[PDB]
């Protein structure tokens, strides 16, 4: 009866993010010191199977992609995790046509989902962004993407 756990991810799966009261960060070291939108009480949803959970309630040491652990960039002493995507992560202001565009909007390089984890009950959902086109925060933001391949 239980479906696939959200800790399991496969390439081509559709991810659905919600970032309540999301704010703006000038630079995220997980994205090579580039602007990002981050929320404290964010929620992640897998569209294909319908599984969803709050980002702060996920033990990111256990999550797997295609049977492999996520690539972790320990930047400035903070451990992040990578959920890659095929294409750019599409995000917009919640409930409205207000829509956002990522930092690498001009290139063919794909985007990724980054989450900072303390190991307890505090996780921050980071989505790539170019500027405050949806606002400097706290602003509700909703996102969507399709999971990509394992890092090489």
């Amino acid at each position, epitope marked *: 009866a239980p479906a696939r756990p959200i800790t399991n991810w496969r390439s081509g799966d559709v991810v659905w993010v919600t970032l309540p009261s999301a704010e703006y960060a000038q630079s995220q070291s997980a994205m090579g010191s580039h602007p990002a939108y981050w929320s404290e009480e964010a929620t992640i949803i897998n569209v294909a199977t319908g599984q969803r959970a709050a980002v702060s309630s996920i033990k990111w040491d256990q999550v797997t992609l295609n049977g492999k652990a996520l690539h972790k960039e320990t930047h400035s002493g903070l451990v992040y995790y990578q959920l890659p995507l095929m294409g750019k992560i599409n995000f917009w202001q919640q409930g409205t046509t207000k829509a956002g565009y990522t930092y690498n909007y001009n290139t063919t390089d794909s985007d990724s989902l980054w989450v900072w984890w303390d190991g307890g009950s505090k996780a921050y959902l980071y989505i790539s962004t170019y500027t*405050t086109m949806l606002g400097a*925060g706290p602003v509700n933001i909703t996102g969507l993407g399709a999971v990509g391949p394992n890092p090489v």
Partner: antibody
Amino acid sequence: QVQLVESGGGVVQPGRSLRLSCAASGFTFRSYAIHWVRQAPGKGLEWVALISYDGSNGYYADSVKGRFTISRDNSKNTVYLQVNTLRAEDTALYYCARDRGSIVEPAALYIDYWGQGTLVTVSS
Amino acid sequence: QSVLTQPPSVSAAPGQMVTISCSGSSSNIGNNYVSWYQHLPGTAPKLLIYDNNKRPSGIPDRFSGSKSGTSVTLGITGLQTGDEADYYCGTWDSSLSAVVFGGGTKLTVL
């Protein structure tokens, strides 16, 4: 107690330079962009300067360009506002405040907390 | 003389409504976001409206703001003697590459 205090006020001879040190406590300096803002007596607010999170970007105002200089020392968690050749128009209570907004074409400013201000009283 | 223009002053009876206009070109208020600031005398100015439509935590619900085209307007419901201060706009000028604040409006009660 999150605070962002300013020091370096007092009566100043005209045509001289000061360093408006800005000590920051209670928050991470490198996650914020610190603004500088002055209010002349009997007048309103006027934005002065701006520095990025890592000190890479330094932004000035049209009326303060050339005479003003912004600097950042993230090791000491203190942003430095170097005034130069103070005039009769900048005898103002220099507030300082932190911002977590952006600067690109659709910029949104969040100048969250403003300090109590330092009073430059350039006169005889 | 600021890019963002405001009425010099405004007044109303206690408990009433006031509104402060704030104009500008597309480079600052048409493209970028705007914010409002209250400067009670003797203390540091506060943030009451951000993102042209939202307020920080702790700001009373009686304050409101909304942008109509290349212009924004402050809205204060239920005027009080305590809420007598100077209100300023705040936004980024992409063309000028600088932060432009509002000219200044003074709330009074009589």
